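Task: complex structure prediction.
Instruction: return C-alpha cells for all chains below.
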Amino acid sequence: RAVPFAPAPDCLPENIPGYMGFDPLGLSTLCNVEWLREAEIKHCRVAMLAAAGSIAQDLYQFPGVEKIVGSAKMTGVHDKILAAASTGDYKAQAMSQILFWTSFLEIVTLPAVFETMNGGPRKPGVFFFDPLGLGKGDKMGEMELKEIKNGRLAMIGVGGMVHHYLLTGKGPIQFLSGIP
Amino acid sequence: FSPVPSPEGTKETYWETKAPSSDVLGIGAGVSSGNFAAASVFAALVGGYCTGQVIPLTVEPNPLFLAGSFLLPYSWALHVAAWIQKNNGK
Amino acid sequence: MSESVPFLKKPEALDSSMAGYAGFDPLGLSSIADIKFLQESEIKHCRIAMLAAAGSIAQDIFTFPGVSKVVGTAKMTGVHDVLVKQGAMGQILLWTSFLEVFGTIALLETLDGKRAPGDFKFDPLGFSKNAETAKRYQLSEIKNGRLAMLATGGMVHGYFITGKGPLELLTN
Amino acid sequence: EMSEAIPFMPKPANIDSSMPGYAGFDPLGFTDYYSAKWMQEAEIKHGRVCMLAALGMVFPEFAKFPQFASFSTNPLEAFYQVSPAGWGQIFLFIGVLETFSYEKSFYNFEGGAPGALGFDPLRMSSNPASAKQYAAAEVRNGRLAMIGFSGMLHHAIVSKQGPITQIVEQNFYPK
Ligand code: CLA
Ligand code: CLA
Ligand code: CLA
Ligand code: CLA
Ligand SMILES: CC1=C(C#C/C(C)=C/C=C/C(C)=C/C=C/C=C(C)/C=C/C=C(\C)C#CC2=C(C)C[C@@H](O)CC2(C)C)C(C)(C)C[C@H](O)C1
Ligand SMILES: CC1=C(C#C/C(C)=C/C=C/C(C)=C/C=C/C=C(C)/C=C/C=C(\C)C#CC2=C(C)C[C@@H](O)CC2(C)C)C(C)(C)C[C@H](O)C1
Ligand SMILES: CC1=C(C#C/C(C)=C/C=C/C(C)=C/C=C/C=C(C)/C=C/C=C(C)/C=C/C2=C(C)CCCC2(C)C)C(C)(C)C[C@H](O)C1
Ligand SMILES: CC1=C(C#C/C(C)=C/C=C/C(C)=C/C=C/C=C(C)/C=C/C=C(C)/C=C/C2=C(C)CCCC2(C)C)C(C)(C)C[C@H](O)C1
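Output:
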C-alpha cells in the first residue's frame, strides 16, 4: 500500500506491528523475516538512544565531563574519549564500560534471536521489559507501532545528525537553531 | 579376534543421513544450532582480532591475545557443529 | 519458561529443588558440562570466594601479630607476592592441595551420584539438623557465595586500579 | 530430430527446448554423460559471475570507489593492488552466497529450476511471458559475458591496460 507501483511481498504478514505495506525492494525474501524484524527493532532502539543522546548531549553536559571532552560534539566525543583512554586515563574508560555492558546484554540475549527463528514463544523484539507496566496496564500494540515508527524516525535522524556534524562542526540543537 | 574394549559410554556414531546425530558432538549434543552459529561467529571475530593484534610477535606478547587467538580454529569446529545441529532440528 | 530471564526458555537441566535456583542459564552451559560437576564447581567457588571476600575485609580491619613486619605495605594481591617469597603461600597451597586430593576422590563419587555436589558432611556444630533450615542455609550459602564471588572480584579489581584495598577504598 | 544450432548433426538427447537458453548446441555431448541440470546450473552460475566480471572489468574505467581511487585501471594490476584483507572479505561474501547454492545443488538438486536461489526481490518473473524472456535473456547475456570477459582478460594480458583504454588508444595488437 505504501508504494502502489511495487506492493509489499506476500512474505510479509499484515498482522505485525508497524506493517504499512512498505517493501518496494522486496528485501524480505532474501533473509529470514523474523531475523529482519528483530534487526529493525534493535536498530530502532539503538538509534532512538542515539537520537535522544545527540540532542541531550548538545543540550546538557554532566559535571566535569567538559574538561576531558574539550569541545567535541556527538561524533567527536567518542574519538576524544578513546584518545584519552589510549593515553591510559582511568576516567576515559566510559566507552569501554558501555561496550562491555551492551556486549554482555547482547551475549546473554544471543540465544533469544535464534529461539524466535526456531519457533519459540518469544516474538521478535520482545524481551518482556515492563518495570513501569505501562504497556501491561494499557493496551499493548499501539506503543509497539509507536516504537517502530519513532525508531525509524530516529534512525534517519541519527544519520542526519552525524552527517550534518561531519560537514559542519555543529551538533543537533545548534544545527537546528542555525541555518547556514 | 578378541573383544576390543572401548571406554564406558561409547555409543554408535556411524551415520548415513544428511547430518550425523548430535551425539557426535559429545558434551555439545544439547546445544542449539543458533548457539553454535553465534558462538562460531563470535569465536571467528574475537579469534581473528586476537590473532591480528599480535601478528608482529614480540618477546612480550599479550598472553590473553595468544589464548584468544585459539578461537579461530575452534570457530571452524563450531560452525560444523552448527550445521549438524540445524540439520537435526536443534 | 524461565523465572529470572522471561524471554528465554526454562533451562532444561535446572530444577526448583536445587539450591539457588532462579532458572538462570542464558547461555545453556548446563548442557555443555555435567550439571553435578558444575554444581560442585560453583559451591567450591562460592566457599573459596566467601572466605576471600571476608578475608580482604578482615585484613584491612586488622593483621595478625608480625605479618606487618613481613609485608611492609602491600595488601590484597600484593601480600601474596611477599608470601611466596616467605613460606605462608606455599604452606597454605600444600594443605589446600592435600584436601583437594580427597576432593578429587569426592568429585569422582559425585559424578557417580554416590555423593551430593559440594556436600563434604562438615557440621562441627549441627545447624542443619532441621532439614528445612538445611534447604534455606544451602540456599543462603549459594547466594552469599555468588555475591562473594562478585564482591571478591570487585574489591580485587579495586586494588588493581587504586591499590587502596577494599575497606580503604571506601575510606579514601 | 536434428540440432537447431548444427542442422547436419542429430539433436542432443538430454537437452530440450524447456531450458531457457536452448539452441540445440552440444556437438561434444557433455549432457549425454554429465547431468544436464548440473551443466545448466553451472552454465548459469559461470555467466552470472562473468556478467559481474565483465561489468567489473569495464567499470573502473569510468569511476572508482574513493578508497581505491588511487588504484590502476588495468584490472590485472588492480587485482594485486587490493589488500589481502579485502580479498578475504570478498571471498567470505562470495562464500556466504555459495552456502545457498551448496544447498540448492548438493542437497536440494531436483526441487526448482537451475540457478533458482530464491533471489527475486523486485518480484519480477510474475508475468509468465516476462519470466520466459528474462530466463532466456539471463542465459544469453551470461554466455556473452563469458566470451566478453575472456576476450577482455586476454586483451589486458597482451596490452597492460583496460579494454576501453586499449580501444581509445587503438592498442589492438601485440607489440
Ligand atoms: C517512543 C518510545 C517508545 C515506545 C512507545 C516503546 C514501546 C514499547 N517498548 Mg520499547 N524502547 C524504546 C522506546 C520505546 N518503546 C527505547 C528507546 C528503548 C531503548 C532503551 C526501548 C527498549 C525496549 C525493550 C528492551 C523492551 C521494550 C518494550 C516495549 C513495549 C512495552 C510497552 C511499554 O510500557 O513501553 C512504553 C514506553 C514508552 C512510553 C516510552 C517512554 C519514553 C519516555 C519519554 C522516556 C524518555 C527518556 C529519554 C531518555 C529522554 C528523551 C528526551 C531528551 C531528548 C531530553 C512497547 C512495545 C518491551 C517489549 O517489547 O516487551 C514487552 C521490551 O522488552 N522497549
Ligand atoms: C580464600 C581465603 C583466604 C586466603 C587465600 C587468605 C590468605 C591470607 N590471609 Mg586471610 N583471612 C581469611 C581468608 C583467606 N585469607 C578469612 C576468612 C579471614 C577471617 C578470619 C582472614 C583473616 C586474615 C587476617 C586477619 C590476616 C590474614 C592474612 C592472610 C595471609 C597469611 C595467611 C594467614 O595467616 O591467614 C590467616 C587466616 C585465617 C586464620 C582464617 C582463615 C581460616 C579459614 C576459615 C580456613 C577454612 C578452610 C575450610 C575449613 C576448608 C574446608 C575443607 C572441606 C573439604 C571440609 C594470606 C595473604 C594475614 C595477612 O597477610 O594480612 C595482611 C593476616 O594478618 N587473613
Ligand atoms: C566478478 C565480479 C567482480 C570482481 C571480482 C571485482 C573485483 C574488484 N573490483 Mg570490481 N566491480 C564489479 C564486479 C567485480 N569487481 C561490478 C559489477 C562493478 C560495478 C558496480 C564493479 C565496480 C568497481 C569499481 C568502481 C571499483 C572496483 C574495484 C574492485 C577491486 C576491489 C573490490 C571492490 O570494491 O569491488 C567493488 C565491486 C562491487 C561493488 C560489485 C558488487 C557486485 C554484487 C555482488 C552485485 C549486487 C547484487 C544486487 C545489486 C543486489 C540488489 C538487491 C536489490 C534489493 C537491489 C577488486 C579487484 C575497485 C578497484 O580497485 O578498481 C580499480 C574500484 O574502485 N570494482
Ligand atoms: C541480463 C541480466 C539478467 C537477467 C535478464 C536475469 C534474469 C533472471 N534472474 Mg538473474 N542474475 C543476473 C543477471 C540477470 N538475471 C546476474 C548478473 C546475477 C548475479 C548478481 C544474477 C543472479 C540471480 C540469482 C541469484 C537469481 C536470479 C534469478 C533470475 C530470474 C528471476 C528474477 C528476474 O526476473 O530478474 C530479472 C532481471 C533483470 C530484468 C535484469 C535487469 C537488471 C537491471 C534493470 C539492469 C542492470 C543494471 C546494472 C547493474 C547497471 C548497469 C550500469 C551500466 C549500464 C552503466 C530471471 C531468470 C532468480 C531465479 O529464480 O532464477 C531462475 C535467482 O535465484 N538471478
Ligand atoms: C520501553 C520501556 C521503558 C523505557 C525506556 C526508554 C529509555 C524510552 C526512551 C524513548 C526515547 C528516548 C525515544 C526518542 C526517540 C527519538 C526520536 C524519535 C528523534 C528523532 C530525530 C529527529 C526527528 C531529528 C532531527 C534533527 C536533524 C536531523 C538535524 C538536527 O541538527 C536537528 C534536528 C533535531 C531537527 C520503561 C522504563 C518506560 C518501562 C516500560 O514498561 C518499557
Ligand atoms: C535478479 C533480480 C534483479 C537484478 C539484478 C542484477 C544486479 C543484474 C545484473 C546484471 C548484469 C551486471 C549484467 C551484465 C552483463 C554484461 C555483459 C553481457 C557484458 C558482456 C561484455 C562483452 C560482450 C564485451 C566486450 C569487449 C571485447 C571482448 C573487446 C573490447 O576491446 C571491447 C568490448 C567491451 C566490446 C533485481 C535486483 C532488479 C530484482 C529482481 O526481482 C531479481
Ligand atoms: C562514532 C563514530 C562515527 C559514527 C557514526 C554514526 C552514528 C553514523 C550513523 C549513520 C546513519 C544512521 C546513517 C543513516 C542515514 C539515513 C538515511 C540515508 C535515510 C535515507 C532516506 C531514504 C533512502 C528514503 C526515504 C523515504 C522518503 C522519501 C520519505 C518516506 C519514507 C521513504 C520512502 C523510505 C564515525 C563513523 C564518524 C567514526 C568515528 O571514529 C566515531
Ligand atoms: C592476578 C594476581 C593475584 C590475584 C587475584 C584475584 C583474587 C583475582 C580475582 C578476580 C575475579 C574474581 C574477578 C571477577 C570478575 C567477575 C565479574 C566480571 C562479574 C561481573 C558481573 C556481571 C558481568 C553482571 C552481573 C549482573 C548485574 C550487574 C545485573 C544483571 C544480572 C547479573 C548477572 C547479576 C595474586 C593474588 C596472585 C597476586 C599476583 O601477584 C597477581
